[PDB]
Design a binder for these strands. Structure first.
Ligand SMILES: NC(=O)c1ccc[n+]([C@@H]2O[C@H](COP(=O)([O-])OP(=O)(O)OC[C@H]3O[C@@H](n4cnc5c(N)ncnc54)[C@H](O)[C@@H]3O)[C@@H](O)[C@H]2O)c1
Length: 255
RNA sequence: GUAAAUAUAGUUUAAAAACAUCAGAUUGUGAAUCUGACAACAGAGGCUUACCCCCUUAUUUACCGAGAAAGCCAUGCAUGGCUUUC
């Protein structure tokens, strides 16, 4: 069970973060949806009930995340789990010879800031918050679960910046786990494949059908409920640490 | 086997369109496109400007011989049986 746990879910107003919040609150936990002010996260928080609260914050801003964690601590008294699901996607080729078009540096920089820098900002602040928790019978003060992508391993054409940020998350998973091992905080990463979230369901139906056919088995877009299930499995297993799990249905992206 | 109808070669409704098909396009999210390929209303034969038919296959449906006239018998003017004629 995860009853009584407090989860800070960044990007918790939509998609994978929303599914994780729904599952965890359904099992009896308390959730803090840390999201952007104009993401409609207050409606989701109210829909989830009393055990869910909304924190309007930008993961790329230290002050916003600090205020969100202060709100979480005041409302629920502590933080046990952190789920970094905030992120943005951008498609852009590094260089197009035919069009003479070059990848803009702003796109790369903002993708980095939102994904990699935002994940690290949340991780460090929430690790500081967890360090105050009395270790349990197993000596654990908390769990941090980051959302990478399979683009961190076989990113496609136009995914240079996205792949850079997700590969950064993958590369920094183990060092942070080693850093926080003395503190008793487990650090894990989930690298989902193609999931039926607003980041993908907004595409034309033919594209969605093709993507579903591209998954070996099951030949469908991943359900966010499956991501939530894997997150809960990581939370409950005390021996999963410093590892990246590919929740992608055995797909390997084509160029 | 013999008469009728019917026959859309990717599909459908019409009497030409819509959906489809093949090749190329590294497409900035209407590519929901652009450049091309294919385009034969079952198959073959004329004949008057135009005026339709004849034939061959394919599918579905139904498939080869007793009228009247007169004389007699039985039943309740009508019916059944028989005899001679065309
Ligand atoms: N959708 C997929 O198929 C897929 C696959 C692999 C990885 N991922 C990653 O999984 C994560 C889950 O996102 P999703 O798929 O649900 O898409 P999503 O857009 O539905 O979820 C992203 C969430 O992050 C929030 N957010 C964005 N920028 C933020 C910021 N600066 N501060 C705070 N909150 C912010 C958004 O408001 C939203 O709630 C993302 O990081 C995504 O890149 C998604």
């Amino acid at each position: 069970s995860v009853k009584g746990l407090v989860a800070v879910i960044t990007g918790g107003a939509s998609g994978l973060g929303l599914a994780t919040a729904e599952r965890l609150v359904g099992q009896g936990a308390s959730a803090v949806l840390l999201d952007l002010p104009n993401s409609g996260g207050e409606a989701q928080a109210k829909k989830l009930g009393n055990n869910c609260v909304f924190a309007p914050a930008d993961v790329t801003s230290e002050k916003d995340v600090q205020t969100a964690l202060a709100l979480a601590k005041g409302k629920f008294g502590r933080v046990d789990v952190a789920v970094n699901c905030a992120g943005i996607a951008v498609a852009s080729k590094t260089y197009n010879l035919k069009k003479g078009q070059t990848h803009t540096l702003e796109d790369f920089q903002r993708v980095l800031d939102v994904n990699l820098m935002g994940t690290f900002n949340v991780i460090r602040l929430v690790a500081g918050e967890m360090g105050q928790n009395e270790p349990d019978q197993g000596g654990q003060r908390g769990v941090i679960i980051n959302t990478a992508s399979v683009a961190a391993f076989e990113g496609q054409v136009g995914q240079a910046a996205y792949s850079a940020s997700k590969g950064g998350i993958v590369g920094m998973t183990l060092p942070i786990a080693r850093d926080l091992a003395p503190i008793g905080i487990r650090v894990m990463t989930i690298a989902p494949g193609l999931f039926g979230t607003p980041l993908l369901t907004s595409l034309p139906e033919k594209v969605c059908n093709f993507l579903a056919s591209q998954v070996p088995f099951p030949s469908r877009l991943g359900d966010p409920a499956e991501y939530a299930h894997l997150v809960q499995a990581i939370i409950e297993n005390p021996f999963l640490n410093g590892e990246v799990i590919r929740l992608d249905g055995a797909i390997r992206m084509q160029p």
